[PDB]
A paper describes a structure:
SapL1 was co-crystallized with α-methyl-fucoside and the structure of the complex was solved by molecular replacement at 2.3 Å resolution in the P21 space group using the coordinates of FleA (PDB code 4D4U34) as the search model. The asymmetric unit contained two monomers, assembled as a dimer with all 295 amino acids visible apart of the N-terminal methionine. SapL1 folds into the canonical six-bladed β-propeller with six-binding sites at the interface between blades typical for this family of lectin. Due to divergence in the tandem repeat sequence forming each blade of the propeller, the six binding sites of SapL1 monomer are not equivalent, but they share important conserved features. Hydrophobic interactions are observed between the C6 of the fucose and at least three residues of the protein (mainly isoleucine, tryptophan/tyrosine and leucine). The O2 and O3 hydroxyls make strong hydrogen bonds with a conserved triad of amino acids consisting of an arginine, a glutamic acid and a tryptophan. The O2 hydroxyl seemed to be the most versatile position, since it established interactions with an adjacent loop only present in four of the six binding sites (BPs 2, 4, 5 and 6). This is particularly interesting since the binding pockets that do not contain this loop (BPs 1 and 3) were mostly occupied by glycerol instead of fucose, indicating that those interactions could be responsible for enhancing the affinity and should be explored for development of inhibitors. The overall fold of SapL1 and FleA as well as the overall dimer are very similar with a rsmd of 1.2 and 1.26 Å, respectively. The affinity of SapL1 for L-fucose and α-methyl-fucoside was determined by Isothermal Titration Calorimetry (ITC) and the Kd was found to be 225 ± 1.52 µM and 190 ± 1.44 µM, respectively with stoichiometry fixed to 1 since the measurements were done in the presence of an excess of ligand.
Numbering used by the authors:
A (entry chain AAA), B (entry chain BBB): 2 to 295
Write the structure that this text describes.
């Protein structure tokens, strides 16, 4: 066990391809460790580092199956960087952007083609989108959502193609959790608002289905009491308070992968620094008490 | 603006000569910054750095008036190090000791001569005493309190001249806050016990008076739900829950300087990452909403 090498609190990101999972956790030296679920849990060790950022790096991960994985982290040079998987080994990606030293990161693949959005916080504390549509044009600026709380968590999810549907959750300068939305016709301010939350309260999103009845979105958020709670959206909506409620360590990040393998990853104190998996199976249960390298 | 350079959460240390205060706060690049109170608050800026540790460095600070100041921090190499003041300018101390990567620091002067104790957590997770008695002998290993919780906070306070009195507060492997005492005739387990507290809950001790009726000890500590509360010992005895109960950011540190200039420093989310001063004046009040560099 080298669970004590895991940060307290760690940056956490999670992806899945069917019942194959990956969880990316921050080591306390800035190392971004991969944990693998392939019918059992492995990795999280020093030889599972896919890159090194600064101590306290946020992690954001996104994928198209396991055909393409992209993991985002912040270096000690206050630049967001990118680790890449294209089926035959990890490599450094072209994504390099200056961020506020306290910036969080969100990232999404758009549809089943290799199209990427990354959301970071500028020095001026605005949320800026980064766009990759193809190699010819490379990384460009997309939308800037304006002033956000300095240090805000940033949580992004996408579903659909033609058009793509994107939601980005972050805190405004009055500590409210708000939502930036895109459905093909410009960015708007969404229906989701959690009033007057804790400064830099952690945020995690997942989504499943398509626009209409099948659609689901879950947004996991820190309460001022070191709980992680859940806002939920299904089909045509009405945001509501979901059943997920769990005690966490102060500052726990949270990451979610979607139904039908709905899992939520946080730090609740197990083995001190270890990450815990919660699983929806007609009700919340302990999916795995502590992730590798425990 | 400048206050956004302070870590979230930040190591905090405080000392005082009469009504002259010094507060040491960690910048989010590991910078150890000095705020000064000389009838008004100043400092906290980049040209007030006295030393640079790893991001999330703990800070311990101890003084004999303002004739002698010692400030302890952890470097990027997992070595606890010292910045010194002898009344003529800041220099690098001889104290360089290996520490677990997540180690805290407690440090005390013993009496009015130049005698120092530093408490750290070793790689094996034991609490280690470092002894400085004179130049002839230099830094030596002292007592070892055994297994502690990996990443425990460490708070240390001393009073008295001969015998010297030392109390060291830290978290055992069962998450209980416990006390190591020295009254001149060997170390013992003290009466202070705070059962099954949050793994690595912050800790801050001040003491005043002398063994006898005039003795004060105040131990500030973090609760599971982001309050800082207080354990109080007055002269003769009986630990009691103190009046001091404030809301904090997740993982806020706490530092305190003794009555009759009793002030508690913590991070409650004012200007996001600013340190707030509480004052004792027949009841707890706000003394300084936000410390420099804000
Ligand atoms: C062998 O390939 C496995 O699956 C890939 C999707 C990556 O997660 C890689 O780190 C892992 O070793
Ligand atoms: C081919 O380019 C690689 O993958 C693209 C989808 C981007 O993530 C890019 O930064 C990376 O270098
Ligand atoms: C049409 O409403 C938009 O899409 C839904 C899926 C929700 O994200 C809602 O808050 C948003 O405003
Ligand atoms: C049926 O309940 C709703 O959807 C489930 C998938 C869970 O997210 C639950 O917390 C939520 O209230
Ligand atoms: C049946 O296994 C459940 O689903 C897997 C895909 C993992 O999330 C595992 O930890 C969980 O117990
Ligand atoms: C004389 O040596 C200086 O003062 C002593 C009290 C110690 O703090 C030592 O590390 C420092 O270099
Ligand atoms: C006499 O009791 C000893 O000294 C007191 C000042 C307290 O620190 C107590 O916990 C300790 O065990
Ligand atoms: C009687 O009041 C006690 O001593 C004061 C000096 C404060 O520490 C207060 O919180 C404590 O309850
Ligand atoms: C006289 O003013 C009070 O005491 C000073 C020594 C400082 O603690 C100051 O911030 C506080 O308001």
């Amino acid at each position: 066990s080298g669970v004590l090498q895991i940060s307290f609190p760690a940056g956490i990101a999670a992806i899945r391809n069917n019942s194959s999972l990956r969880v990316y956790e921050a080591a306390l030296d800035g190392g971004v460790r991969e944990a693998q679920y392939e019918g059992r849990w492995a990795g999280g060790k020093p030889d599972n580092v896919i890159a090194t950022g600064k101590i306290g790096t946020p992690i954001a991960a996104t994928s198209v199956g396991f055909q393409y994985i992209r993991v985002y982290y912040v270096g000690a040079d206050n630049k967001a960087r990118e680790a890449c998987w294209d089926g035959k080994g990890w490599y450094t990606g072209a994504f390099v952007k200056d961020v506020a030293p306290y910036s969080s990161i969100g990232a999404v693949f758009l549809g089943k083609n290799i199209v990427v959005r990354v959301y970071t916080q500028n020095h001026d504390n605005t949320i800026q989108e980064w766009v990759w549509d193809s190699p010819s044009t490379g990384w460009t600026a997309g939308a800037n959502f304006g002033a956000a709380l300095p240090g805000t968590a940033i949580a992004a999810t996408s579903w659909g193609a033609g058009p793509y549907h994107i939601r980005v959750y972050f805190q405004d300068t009055n500590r409210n959790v708000i939502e930036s939305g895109w459905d093909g016709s410009g960015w708007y301010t969404g229906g989701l608002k959690i009033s007057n939350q804790s400064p830099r309260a952690s945020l995690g999103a997942t989504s499943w289905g398509e626009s209409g009845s099948s659609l689901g979105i879950r947004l996991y958020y820190a309460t001022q009491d070191n709980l992680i709670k859940e806002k939920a959206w299904d089909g045509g909506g009405g945001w509501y308070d979901g059943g997920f409620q769990q005690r966490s360590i102060p500052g726990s990040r949270v990451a979610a992968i979607p139904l039908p393998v709905l899992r939520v990853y946080l730090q609740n104190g197990t083995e001190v620094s270890g990450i815990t998996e919660y699983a929806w199976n007609s009700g919340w249960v302990v999916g795995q008490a502590v992730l590798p390298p425990a």
